[PDB]
């Protein structure tokens, strides 16, 4: 059971002054740590005792807060500061949770949605997979809802998203539908519906 | 002599006694640089009586005792000659004679717990004040009224030991402090604990 | 320089045993609490277990009580994690970490910040045999893309274990290509896709092959993506 809560994402540009709020369970007092993680890599202690700069850590990181409301602030955002940040109660090992993703701000861009039916060869193996791309959209949160014969699908879809592209500061999404050729013969209303901020209404292809 | 006094075992001992069961370590036949002791780090209290700290780098003593225990911050002031209160009266008492040093530091980061740590205890009741350096580890039920308790807790019948609740929300008067008390004993004997200069 | 060097990670079947090791240097090991932290794919860090400098008090995450034991040899400046009865979900990267402050005696008592961290070993709990992937196209049909934006690709399906390396024309098509992160299907096999956004007009008439490469099984497929 987790002990701390910070927002899922914060969006910022190099140079900016960034703050991350953190609400702790009562009764933590002083014992609050901030940790930085780049993907796949070990996390790094940035701040301890809620406001102490850890050795070797750049002075632009600072920590403040009393009681149950704490906050990490990054005065002058550098490009290497985009990472995930966790606020962590420093006793009885609480779980980390989703942390706060520090991503690059950018104008909101809608995804170029594509739909791809299953292969010939894969239908020789006896299984079918339907791919719905979502290319180069800024607001990462998205909905993709498959529709077989205008009925909603559940539990048969798998997504995976790339990290923010270095060049265009956008995200991409793929969603895969799993279907056996036995269950693939009741077909031909196969749609992908994307609910996204860049679109005034949901789009289907 | 020549070999260095083992202050590390006292000062860096991982766990400290409860004040009521305070511990005493005897220091003998060794050489003790007290300027390094200052310089271990960050002692919130380093007070001496009957001796100057800038001088027991030059002094020898028959024996040196080191008493350690844990208390609340706002009780550290009771570890001095002439003090009164729960700790001085009922748990640990220095004489007016005292020639030694009282050293203490905040140990929140080692002795507190998020819901409170109740393992450090102090004696809350006693029928008379402790004598200097006396130790009481007894747990007789305390008869605060006229009715013989006969070993069972009643309204005027209290178990004599009470628990600190060390929790990080406390703030310094109620956070735990580790205390070390050094006694310097000139007994009718050879000196064996000396400063590096003498 | 403090260093923490991890070893012992690898692939084990459900129910197996693994022993992890975290060799420590650059500090007085026996004075610091140490812990094991891990990160399963697509989840967040979690404390596996921890132990005070002396070894006399230890903590376990609920999901691993009774199955993992943490220990240390202070002589050899080494921390261990004996893992038994492993389950699929124990699959993760395991880091070891050192407590900033020294001198804890009880693992739930005191303040616990972790300054130094090892690099991590990967632990894989699976009964999948080494196997190479299969490559399927991603339908470069000309419907709905009569303009300058068109999407195609390949599909690296049903391999174990990771990794899979995808190139397009031996590293010559760099701009516009997004290789997705793989996913663990319910079959116990990995799948991903490699999509390229190309101007549909020509940009090289059908000059595209995806260079899939699966080192564990020695599989290389150059599949051409034609309508
Ligand atoms: C206590 O321990 C630390 C290292 O473990 C050391 O730097 C410090 O000097 C020690 N203090 C004493 C009084 O020995």
Author numbering:
A (entry chain L): 2 to 206
B (entry chain E): 332 to 529
C (entry chain C): 15 to 241
What do the study authors state?
In the present study, we isolated a fully human neutralizing antibody, JS026, from a convalescent patient. As an antiviral agent, numerous mAbs recognize the epitopes that overlap with ACE2-binding sites in the SARS-CoV-2-RBD. The majority of SARS-CoV-2-neutralizing mAbs authorized or in development are clustered to class 1–4 as structural comparisons revealed these molecules flexibly direct to different epitopes on the RBD. The comparative analysis revealed that JS026 binding to SARS-CoV-2-RBD mainly located between epitopes for class 2 and class 3 mAbs as opposed to that of class 1 (etesevimab) antibodies.
To gain insights into the structural basis of the blocking, we solved the crystal structures of JS026-Fab/RBD at a resolution of 2.5 Å. Structural analyses revealed that JS026 blocks SARS-CoV-2-RBD binding to hACE2 mainly through the steric clash and the mAb inclines to share overlapping sites of class 3 antibodies instead of etesevimab. The competition-binding assay indicated JS026 locates between epitopes for class 2 (P2B-2F6) and class 3 (S309) mAbs as opposed to that of class 1 (etesevimab) antibodies. The structure revealed that N440 forms 29 contacts with JS026 and two hydrogen bonds with A111 (HCDR3) and W32 (LCDR1) of JS026, and its mutation to Lys may evaded the antibody. Bio-Layer Interferometry (BLI) assays demonstrated that JS026 bound to the wild-type (WT) RBD protein with a KD of 2.04 nM, to VOCs RBD antigens with similar affinities. Strikingly, a potent mAb, JS026, showed broadly blocking all five RBDs binding to ACE2 receptor with a median half-maximal inhibitory concentration (IC50) value of 0.6-3.2 μg/mL. According to the pseudovirus neutralization assay, JS026 exhibited very low 50% neutralization dose (ND50) values of 5.6-10.8 ng/mL for main circulating SARS-CoV-2 VOCs. Interestingly, a combination of etesevimab and JS026 showed greatly enhanced neutralizing potency (ND50 = 15.5 ng/mL), against SARS-CoV-2. These results indicate etesevimab and JS026 targeting-non-overlapping sites on the RBD exhibited synergistic neutralization in vitro.
